[PDB]
Amino acid sequence: MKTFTAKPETVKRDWYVVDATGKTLGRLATELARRLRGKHKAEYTPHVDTGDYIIVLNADKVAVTGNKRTDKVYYHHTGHIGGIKQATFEEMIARRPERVIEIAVKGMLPKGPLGRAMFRKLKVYAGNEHNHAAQQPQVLDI
Amino acid sequence: MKVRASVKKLCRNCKIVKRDGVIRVICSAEPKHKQRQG
Amino acid sequence: SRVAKAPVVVPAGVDVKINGQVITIKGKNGELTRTLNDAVEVKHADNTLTFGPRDGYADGWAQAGTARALLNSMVIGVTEGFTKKLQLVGVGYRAAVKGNVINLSLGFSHPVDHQLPAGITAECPTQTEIVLKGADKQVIGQVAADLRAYRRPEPYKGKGVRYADEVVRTKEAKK
């Protein structure tokens, strides 16, 4: 007997809110990636996103230990010849403070179509006020 | 400042100290004596 | 540790309020404030602020020594006030004060007019001398280092904004 395979028409999704005013970036992002792939759900399948929508309010006070707030650097290539742009942690915070959590979970998540779908279910905010209160999201200690 | 790769005290007034992760010799009297392990 | 062991004797006329990990101190020469480190316990032992580390840390005794020396400098500032002296040896190198700017004149074709911060006052009795009073030792050493940095004293003639508390050495202009 072919065991259970969760059909994407009948699987249901919840809504979670994560506080991030001092969580460590790597551990927080790993737990976001775990709930986003859906591995807290017993109807789990690889080829079907059984994930859960996660709203990370206050995504700029994510605290990083070590000397990483002045030493951890981020690289992205433009596409031209000399274009290797590079910004530290505090400078990436000062430019666009949600890109840090988005790059972290975009590193941890799978790659390709389903990985980009699981990332599409992750929307983060640099403040304390979201606009998805019509969804009834529940808080989650993560 | 001579940027040696082996700093070494050359009198009694010289003091070996550690700024920023490098070693330095700072002297009170002779500015030739001032060194830095780099 | 060793400086952190013998605590400071705060006299009368100088209030202190332990605002958790902040300390404020008030008096006749103005008030000061210092955010202490989060590994350092201070206490008010009714005429004396005693010191120790909060444990859970191994950076205890260095930080407690810094906290003791900072409160000592704060008490000395609020009850007496420091008074530094700079001077201008050279050819016509002349200063003046105008309330809170020090209109220097140091051979610079643009005029060097340094704007002094809040808790600092100055007086230039001799027109090659500056004497300035203050409460916060760090910022008055800062302003004195700024004025000495405007014209560092050379090793050939001793000109420039020479410290009156630190003499220098001058190389002979040989040949």
Place this chain on the structure above:
Amino acid sequence: IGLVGKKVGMTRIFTEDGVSIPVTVIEVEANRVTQVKDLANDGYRAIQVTTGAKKANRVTKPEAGHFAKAGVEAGRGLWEFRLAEGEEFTVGQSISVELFADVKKVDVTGTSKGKGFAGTVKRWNFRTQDATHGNSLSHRVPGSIGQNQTPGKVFKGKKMAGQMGNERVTVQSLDVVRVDAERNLLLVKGAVPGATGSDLIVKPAVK
């Protein structure tokens, strides 16, 4: 904020010194304001201007309803200028030409004259090879556009043949020579972009 002129032609201005100034004659009609945008409504502080007069049987019903609700006469286009803090423009106002009664330098932005499918020698100022001395079918061609096998790709932004011009370009800090409040003229010095009949955004200078 700026004005939206139409570049008529270039001519001289003589002074009593005897100097000759290349003067461009930007006519500037009364620029109508159609819609003023603020933070709570829209997202920035900026106004919308229009000039001229289009045919009634050529302005479509969205544009005509936009202008008629805006409360001005049916113009000929739309442009949008940011508001430096200290300007509160009314939606019925009509920005005249006397805005430049105090400035000395303006920055003029317009569509440059499109010169076709211009090659490399005309476009990016390359050079040529020889016209004799053996040279065969290669008098004005680009030449080597890369290296051998590493990269193994023409690097992005390589200078090549394409369409020169017909693009918005901006000249910075041309001196205003005259402001004619009667003929509705702004007389600048130099070489502004665009041909006769081009539409030029004239702003007060930055540098």
Place this chain on the structure above:
RNA sequence: GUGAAGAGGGAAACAACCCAGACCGCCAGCUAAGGUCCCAAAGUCAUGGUUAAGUGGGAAACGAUGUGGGAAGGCCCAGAC
């Protein structure tokens, strides 16, 4: 000895290095090399340390009051630095 004439698992990828010898089927279990935060199956497992360098995750002569451990010491409660 292995490849050649040998598949599989590991070392990201990587004939010869580590475990291992594929007769065929099974949506059964135990395990070796290697591993158990996430990509990626399994310990954000327990006990006690060490590191502050991203060392771990390329490296020498030589230099250094980095820091932890041991043992010997030579001045010192008649006053040591």
Place this chain on the structure above:
RNA sequence: CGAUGUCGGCUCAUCACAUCCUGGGGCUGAAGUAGGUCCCAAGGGUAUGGCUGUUCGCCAUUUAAAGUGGUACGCGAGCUG
């Protein structure tokens, strides 16, 4: 080797830092000017001619300087030969 065309010139270049200028400094057997040497720094800039096939060179004359290297000793499905 059932083929990847091999020196130099032209035309395009792009990268590295072990920097030639410009920027910032520390020391000087640095009075000033001109310097010497060392540390950070690659954003831009970096010569015309005589002779040779030349790269290289020597030379004449400028320049703020006439960088050192890679890129199949870059570049012949682009060009002499």
Place this chain on the structure above:
RNA sequence: UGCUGAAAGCAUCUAAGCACGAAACUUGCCCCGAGAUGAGUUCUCCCUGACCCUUUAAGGGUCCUGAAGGAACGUUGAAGA
């Protein structure tokens, strides 16, 4: 380069804290730019009819309607293969 400052009663630009510092990096100036699938924002204009069916669905077919606008054609352009 410093100011204050302890582990190290002194000293100390540093471990706590703060200030200064380059043509380098982020900006400021110019240009592209919502295919930015994360496809955004604001303004304006237009469509306000009937039934018929079975598997009832974000379903299909019929009669009337054809708006805003676009496209086509023509005269063309200091726009252009």
